[PDB]
Design a binder for this molecule. Structure first.
Ligand SMILES: [K+]
Length: 120
């Protein structure tokens, strides 16, 4: 499986395994619960193999991942995607053109929720 990179708001238990690289000492407890994550990046190997990285967003990056307008972009494709609407504080679906969009653009609603739940 190709790696995943999850952007998330800091949250002491992150609800979704072995840590390969983290700025801090995470603890993973089995859904799973990630404890101790701080602003920054973490890399895990998942086996029953795959890469999972978790980027705990800064407020500055949160502007890009949550506060930016949805962006169809220049291409004429049709990709169902998700963006966060901070005005209404909810994840909405939109059709993405497939290129040159911005960071407020998630493949899965759950990923949008993780990236932006609680942002205004
Ligand atoms: K989805």
């Amino acid at each position: 499986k190709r790696g995943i990179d999850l952007k998330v708001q800091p949250q002491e238990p992150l609800v979704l395994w072995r840590l390969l690289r983290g700025d801090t000492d995470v603890r993973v407890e089995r859904q799973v619960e990630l404890w101790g994550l701080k602003e920054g990046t973490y890399l895990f190997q998942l086996t029953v193999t795959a890469n999972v990285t978790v980027t705990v967003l800064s407020t500055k990056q949160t502007e890009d991942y949550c506060l930016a307008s949805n962006k169809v972009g220049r291409c004429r494709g049709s990709f169902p995607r998700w963006y966060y609407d901070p005005t209404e504080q909810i994840c909405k679906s939109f059709v993405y053109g497939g290129c040159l969009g911005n960071k407020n653009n998630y493949l899965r609603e759950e990923e949008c929720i993780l990236a932006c739940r609680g942002v205004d």
